[PDB]
Amino acid sequence: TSVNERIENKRRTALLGGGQRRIDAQHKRGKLTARERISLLLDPGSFVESDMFVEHRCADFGMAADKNKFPGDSVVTGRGRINGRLVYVFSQDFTVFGGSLSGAHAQKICKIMDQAITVGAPVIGLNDSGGARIQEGVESLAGYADIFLRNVTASGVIPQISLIMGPCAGGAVYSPALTDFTFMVKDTSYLFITGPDVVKSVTNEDVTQEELGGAKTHTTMSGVAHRAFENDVDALCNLRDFFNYLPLSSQDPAPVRECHDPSDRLVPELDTIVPLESTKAYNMVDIIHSVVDEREFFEIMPNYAKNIIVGFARMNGRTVGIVGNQPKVASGCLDINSSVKGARFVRFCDAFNIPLITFVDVPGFLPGTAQEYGGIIRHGAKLLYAFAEATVPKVTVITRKAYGGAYDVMSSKHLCGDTNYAWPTAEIAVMGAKGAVEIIFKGHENVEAAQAEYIEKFANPFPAAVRGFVDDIIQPSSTRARICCDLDVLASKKVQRPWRKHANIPL
Amino acid sequence: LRNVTASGVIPQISLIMGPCAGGAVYSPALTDFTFMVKDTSYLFITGPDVVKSVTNEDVTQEELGGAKTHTTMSGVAHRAFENDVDALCNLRDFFNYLPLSSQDPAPVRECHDPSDRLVPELDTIVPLESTKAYNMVDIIHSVVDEREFFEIMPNYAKNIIVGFARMNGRTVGIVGNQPKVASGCLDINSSVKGARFVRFCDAFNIPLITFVDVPGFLPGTAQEYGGIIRHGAKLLYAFAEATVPKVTVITRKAYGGAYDVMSSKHLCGDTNYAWPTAEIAVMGAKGAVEIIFKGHENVEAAQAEYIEKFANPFPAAVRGFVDDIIQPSSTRARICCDLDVLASKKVQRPWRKHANIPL
Amino acid sequence: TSVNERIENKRRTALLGGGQRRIDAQHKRGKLTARERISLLLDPGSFVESDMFVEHRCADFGMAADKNKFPGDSVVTGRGRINGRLVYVFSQDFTVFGGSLSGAHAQKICKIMDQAITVGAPVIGLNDSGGARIQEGVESLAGYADIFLRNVTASGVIPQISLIMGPCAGGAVYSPALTDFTFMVKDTSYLFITGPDVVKSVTNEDVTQEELGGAKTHTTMSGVAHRAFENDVDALCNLRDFFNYLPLSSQDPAPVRECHDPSDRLVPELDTIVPLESTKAYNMVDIIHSVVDEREFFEIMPNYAKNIIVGFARMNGRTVGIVGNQPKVASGCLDINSSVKGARFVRFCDAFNIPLITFVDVPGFLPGTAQEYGGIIRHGAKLLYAFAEATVPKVTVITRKAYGGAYDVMSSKHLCGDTNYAWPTAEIAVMGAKGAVEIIFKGHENVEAAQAEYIEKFANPFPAAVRGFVDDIIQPSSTRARICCDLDVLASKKVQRPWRKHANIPL
Amino acid sequence: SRMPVIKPDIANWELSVKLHDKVHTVVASNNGSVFSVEVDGSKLNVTSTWNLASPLLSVSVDGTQRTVQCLSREAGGNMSIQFLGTVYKVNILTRLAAELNKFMLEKVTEDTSSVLRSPMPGVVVAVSVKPGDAVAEGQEICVIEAMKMQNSMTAGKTGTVKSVHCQAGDTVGEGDLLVELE
Amino acid sequence: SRMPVIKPDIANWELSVKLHDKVHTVVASNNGSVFSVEVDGSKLNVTSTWNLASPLLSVSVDGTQRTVQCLSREAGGNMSIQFLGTVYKVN
Ligand SMILES: *C(=O)CCCC[C@@H]1SC[C@@H]2NC(=O)N[C@@H]21
Ligand SMILES: *C(=O)CCCC[C@@H]1SC[C@@H]2NC(=O)N[C@@H]21
């Protein structure tokens, strides 16, 4: 056998992976293989695979046998482009040793992370594993340590996107916790530290795989996964479109893309969304959809902390992040869960120079022992900090209510905001007229007259505007045009801040 | 705005000595440490009158926002003191640990405790029986200068210990596991307290000493549904980001991913010592042998062979995971030496607008 | 057997090394072992050994047998102090596998280099090896690559000192080429790429071990080794004293040490060293010894390029570097070899903030085809650059001759010098009076009168001094005091230079 | 200026276009303002200005003047086009996506729009219906008011009421059944 | 200020001092200006100011006034001392 023949056989084996019968199982299971997934993700013909001939060096427990020598060692790594833009990817291959992490496995992933940091290119990981490769022992633990170090170092330098498309257990579960966004695939992906076998052995509780770490749990109740997609093909199609929003590095401005939607059009549909009756809820999403370019909005965590809306959109071609209240759910009140989702989204957009638009309608905080015992004070400070720290353009629109300390938490002008607009129905106060009059006028005669006088003077947007809290009071139909104008002039804005070794968010 | 701007520039300490309601409740959430006064201080957003009006639940003032609740169950207050006079006396002594600004080195104060003394009391604290717990605090007290240790949140997340002490006059921060509680396992609550403490000490140039003895993570749906994955990443990040000296001592167990979370050498640590009872592995010998040797004859022989080779500190040390294996009696002197030479250590890191911790 | 018993046996084996019989051979051979050498080098009780229990992971060719498992894997690594000052060391142990380099061998060395860079501590290596461990194959080549990368990265950050105390072959020979100083041991150390067996096989020439790579060759003819010492004990004793001159890092100022030698004493012995007769040579070393503190001078390469003197000394407690001409050899003329030694010494002292004192007495360059064909132009530019680039204090004293382009090469004031003094016998000119008059006055009558007129006006130190080339003309007896004064006021001097990615020395 | 973008040199677009129950083979290429499209062997030329933001897109297909409206678009290939007044649902995948999509499990889910449950704990203050009442999609059925905010619960299905399970004055929790539709 | 220097805590100096053909055992300790030196069991006290730069070093050895000159010193232990006019080579 010649050298060239050996090489050709090594290429064909790396392409097959764990063997055709294991591929057949993956397809029976409704899953794509690691190499098929890359072909869908990246532009045709743009993918360049690295280190395809790397094999493990473990010789213990029979691992020195030729029957265990799978070139590629369970990961596909390399670089490519999505719509002409450079991206680094890796995808874990479940057909070779179960997708378990070896020393060399982690290495290959680390090397492309080092290039991505060096050139300033994003990294997308497609995760699917069973955990560490116990046959190597502590080399897989060193593998995890090296990946974790890169994931932390890359934070704020390049965006890191993780899509989980299968099981995930052991140390693998912490890389999505270090990246910026985590997505899952409904009823196909799992994310858990230990399996149901350990849970039942430790505590006398019964649980199945879908209940312990299923995609529905992590998108609806734990707040870990940002969005689950129906299947592998739809998940990668939406991932490509999501990719188009983000810059390649934090040194880059928010991407600007060709846009046909005139920036100066009016939106008459906004003038009557907000009811005059204070106890009538409305859907904030109707406002978000009508303002954003071509009515396209990418919603993050649609099923978790529904009282606050966060997501991506484009206005006049430029990527922006949108945060707003949802009065339809829990009167639009802040709670622990909403503060966690908000702070994380805001922090990402600030780090990568993506402007923020805030739609405020918040009557206060959710009362009760469930929130007080949960540390609502500690968690609420997370959203206040996330806005106060921001140095990217911030445009706030107040649609109806902003009572109490929630006014400042939801990116008020006094946290170094750029512009703040009020709609005619906006009301800014420490509390509603009923509470304020009962406290201010206590024991006096003709309280009912005092109630009428207070409402006429303070139950509107004027006592705040005349003080400099609001820059203008605008007709809702003009909101989009007003925001577009601010975005196109604040984009070159820089501010100074004292030197710090690093930030100290309340956590 | 000032409380956020000052973060990482000057330390901000808040002591609550009475009621606190409304927007006032968020300034302690922006400062670095929050203390309370037992049965005198309260911290709540709305009073019991609002809670009863909104939801059909009965609660009193001490239950809704009392000092005992915030130091034991919510994890908001770092420590409650008996009364106003004792609270300020302990606050003065706490003040003496901290630098005035992040531009300053950790304070160094006159110390009479010889830096090179041995501590024979350490050699027999850790039992040879793997299912016998011990009190980590006995190790912490015997190492630190003059046996003075300032414990933070003594009644919250008892499975992890964090606090301040001085070694050879220099202020250091100490983090360690407590095997006495929940076998020394990590959970959501312990990760939250750890990450916050580590982050403060790093920002103000206070070295870290870590005492590791962690068998893994607390299993169960209570932790999985609570986002144990998300919260565990907080402590891993807090150590990985640190640029101040980090000295780790492994006393007995470090299994699984918890090995790296508890400030392993592979997160840019400076020194890492093992005691003779240390064992570093992906999992214990029983699980590993049942998985490695599946369906083979004479498994019992394979079990003996595996334990003899891997159930010790050697497969990690021979790979460069551990710098030395030391007699426990010498631990204090070894740490003191590292602190007095790593104090001038600087590292470079790529430019970032700001950090992005998983939250 | 208990765990504690196993540990104790592992400690005793690591201390023994390759076995008592191999130690006996080392002592028969007049050599110390690697651990005995460290005890001599470092302060008593200050040494802390790292990674004493590390073993190789190679399982091929019988390397998995227990009989080949030597803890420590042929190197002693660790840290200590010399006179209270932190230093990192390693010493190669010849008794285990011949001192050959394994993967793990290089690792252990790399780890202490990484600490030394992190804290800012020097590294001293004691080298003795036979080359790569061929049983591992390409892992030892990766070992060399990692060491080489650290040795380059540390340059200009911490000083790196290498003492060769035995044979050295293969890739090992390049680490002393990357460190700052290389020392050897007479008739015990060797430094060669291939042995005499390869040389005789390739070319029809006979050579023995001492001729091919002996210490005498490298200190006298190739210019590779800076100094050879008689034996192992004397070599380490002089190494400790050498260590005391250097800073721990380039961020530190030149060390200052208690000194009893008054800084303001006169040196009458200098006034009559330089003869009035232009063709009478004198020994520059008499001047160097009389100026330096307590007449202690550390001479580098005493037997190579004898026409130029470089070395270390202390003036008023502060470490300084001294460079000067030696008129006793080749009239004090510059050649290829002298330029190479000078540029390297000057470059080190500049990088680590050690002031320079220059004693100039140079009539020009060595003529002839031997120098022209050797690239005298290219090599002479090395010393000119090394001085011109320097940003540390430079004090020059001109004792007698400085003709031609050599004036500027030997650190003239026009290369951003700080002070430049002339003795009464100094003469600065393009060429001597005889050549200049024959060229200036060609074909004229009464040339002899023109010769007398030229000598009276130009054959002295005045045409240069009146132009600003010389700051003062001083009596030699005051030289030491004048230099001490300049050193104590230039020590805080900083200069600005344009940004550069890196320097581009002519090579 | 830091990261030059290179336009993919795509000569042909090979699409698999699913309509009602047939999958058609379509190959398109761009020549500026006109797309040359082969639909199962038939040649068509579609010319337009392709302003993608306007609600009314005017196209000329082999000289035939058409106006279409794009009502929705998804990354998964779904596109809703109103053509001659009727909305057609077309799923456009690339050749590669269509060939791999055959490996996806055809899972069947349950349409749970007739069972109307309380989305939020509180007191029921109005019920607009009794059994037999007609219900339209989007029709308000019950009104629950907690935390000083009237929350309307609407029907997700056109039908009639079979049973009203919670009445006005009753207190309900999260997930409790309010009304059951046919 | 970056790298604190720690003075070795040396209680006793145990030296092997070679003269002409004999090797002597000498143990010295410092108590400030006076060195307490035991030379093969004999106790001597050497007091001086120990100015190491002067060509003339004045010492007092058990009350006996001596002047010595150090003519050379090497790292290898060689030291040339002129004592009563005669130069002795001690290693
Ligand atoms: C009735 O008295 C309940 C009042 C609750 C109104 C809302 S709920 C959350 C905010 N907190 C508060 O005190 N009022 C707001
Ligand atoms: C019995 O089989 C229960 C085993 C639990 C042991 C501990 S508890 C937490 C760690 N996780 C794990 O799987 N083992 C460790």
Ligand SMILES: *C(=O)CCCC[C@@H]1SC[C@@H]2NC(=O)N[C@@H]21
């Ligand atoms: C006799 O004419 C030989 C003259 C050499 C004098 C010296 S040697 C090197 C310098 N170069 C030169 O031209 N003169 C100097």
